[PDB]
């Protein structure tokens, strides 16, 4: 079949928002494509990260992977650093992309603030984003809209190389969902759902419990008409909240709309508050089942083995292509 | 013993001038410390390289490597590439290297002319050749001048990640021969002897033929006075073809200066000549062995597993520090 990869950073517990946009796809597409999933911790390294805290939210978001029903027999789940050829690819990628292509990725200017001092690994995440899905001869990367542009660079990439060194590469094609692609923050509808927000009120994990959703939720940003309806530019916290409500519930905006007529926010967000709670119960309880065993660490050390056959392989055809080492 | 790591890109032949600045000094070294020597080909990369060519030039260099005396029992000689916890810990050091400090790189500005679009492996050398130096636990880095800088960026790294996250790696140190440091470009006495200058008359290789020699030394750069005597400022050429005459000879810039009076440059430089094709010539012979039997590879083999021991288990121990993948 066709070839996906999708990664996730190590970087927090998975909000809402890379549930809808991206993890929740995932279910479904294990069985239609020969998936390879990551668990991205050199990624979440660009930034600052307590070591322990990193080791937890690793082994945790694999245990989310598999907790929301991904198959360990029908896709490859696995940890990225322990996949070197990662780490390879990344760097005879670095060698071909141009500082101006990096210095302009969106990502990049955002996570760069003004801030005073910020580590490369930050300009030359792309490149290695660009590896993790070439390494495996990728058709789709199914996910969310801010990643979009980052999958272009990684095509010119492909491209370049191909006509650069001869035909390799497969040049991928991202596959961002038609509806809760960029799931925004509760408490700012301007910016994304975003898990390491430093204000925990902006994102609802895939771990928070019944009473501290009803808190994030109560408190999200609405705004004054107590109308619940969809508006992006009018009502930009309303109209992020209906999606959630839509998305996560199979009614459409407006079966919600006309639900909620002549009603007002506080029993709308309570609702919601359920919609999202009951959503992630089932999650939860088998999330809990492969922390407490030794299952969890089988599967990743058979995934890691599985795709350091199919990466170092990659690896080989990339150094025979620049020329690096001998012939082997 | 102290142990100490050195590399040499495989961007062309080496010349004369890697020879005098650091090779030359790895023969009587490998006896005194632990050395590590490395063929740096993904540092090579950083620039165009044809395949065909970096696939040849690296194993001249070993086999060079080999020729001028480096006893493989002694010293460890081996491929980067073929390495990957050079490309590991790279990655992890690109983490905590900051742009600014990067894109202050003299060797950067500098191979970063004006020129429209530069590969992000020009601005990431550094980090690279970071790991290449940290990886070993080198006290010792023999190099010619230039690489002075890249090495205090190494240490900086080095204790930057011995505090933020815990003592791990040895704070090394350059050591910069009192001679022959900064050998110059035979064709403009400002410019270093660079092996990958555009323009061949620039330098002299280890494999440069007697005729060859004769016709560069010739064409050297020199000036009016017709006086064979050393002033770095005045005449810079003549002062340049002193000190390799010198080191190469045993002969003091003095001596040289006094058995060279009433007498002109035509004849100082056919003696030149003779005495770098002598220098070159149990080299060369030993060269041809090398490169015609298999007992190269097995050499660079051994080197390969040898340094794949120590190097991976200082990214499991980096891996640890700064809590990626799991606990091994
Ligand atoms: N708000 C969002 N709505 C819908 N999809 C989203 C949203 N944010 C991210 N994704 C999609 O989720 C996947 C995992 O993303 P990632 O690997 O964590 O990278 P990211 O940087 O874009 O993720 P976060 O923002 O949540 O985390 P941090 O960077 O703060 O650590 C991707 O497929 C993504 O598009
Ligand atoms: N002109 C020189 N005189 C004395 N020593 C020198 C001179 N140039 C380099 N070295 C020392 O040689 C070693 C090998 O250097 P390298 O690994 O090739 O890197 P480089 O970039 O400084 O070397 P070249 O200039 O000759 O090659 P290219 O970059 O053009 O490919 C180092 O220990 C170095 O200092
Ligand atoms: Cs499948
Ligand atoms: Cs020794």
Not at 287 to 306: F, T
Request: with cysteine; proline share 4%.
């Amino acid at each position: 079949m066709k070839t996906i990869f999708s990664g996730i950073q190590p970087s927090g517990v998975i909000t809402i928002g890379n549930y809808i946009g991206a993890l929740r796809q995932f279910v479904e597409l294990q069985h239609e494509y020969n998936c390879y999933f990551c668990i991205v911790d050199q990624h979440a390294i660009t930034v600052w990260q307590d070591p322990h805290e990193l080791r937890q939210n690793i082994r945790r978001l694999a245990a989310l992977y598999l907790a929301v029903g991904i198959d360990p027999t029908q896709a490859t789940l696995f940890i990225q650093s322990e996949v070197p050829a990662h780490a390879q690819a990344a760097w005879m990628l670095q060698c071909i992309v141009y500082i101006g292509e990096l210095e302009r990725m969106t990502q990049f200017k955002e996570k760069s603030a003004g801030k005073e001092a910020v580590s490369a690994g930050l300009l030359t995440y792309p490149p290695l984003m660009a590896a993790d899905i070439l390494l495996y001869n990728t058709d789709i990367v199914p996910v969310g809209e801010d990643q979009k542009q980052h999958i272009e660079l990684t095509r010119d990439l492909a491209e370049r190389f191909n006509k650069r060194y001869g035909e390799l590469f497969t040049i991928p094609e991202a596959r961002i969902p038609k509806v809760g692609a960029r799931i925004m923050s509760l408490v700012d509808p301007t910016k994304k759902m975003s898990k390491s927000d430093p204000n925990p009120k902006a994102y609802i994990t895939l771990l928070d419990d019944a009473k501290t959703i009803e808190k994030k939720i109560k408190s999200a940003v609405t705004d004054s008409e107590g109308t619940i309806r969809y508006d992006k530019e009018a009502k930009p916290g309303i109209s992020n909240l209906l999606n959630i409500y839509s998305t996560l519930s199979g009614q459409s905006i407006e079966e919600l709309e006309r639900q909620y007529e002549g009603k007002g926010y506080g029993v709308f967000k309570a609702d919601l508050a359920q919609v999202v709670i009951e959503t992630l119960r089932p999650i939860q309880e088998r999330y809990h089942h492969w922390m407490e065993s030794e299952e969890l660490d089988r599967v990743l050390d058979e995934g890691a083995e599985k795709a350091n056959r199919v990466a170092s392989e990659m690896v080989r055809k990339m150094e025979q292509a620049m020329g690096l080492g001998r012939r082997r």
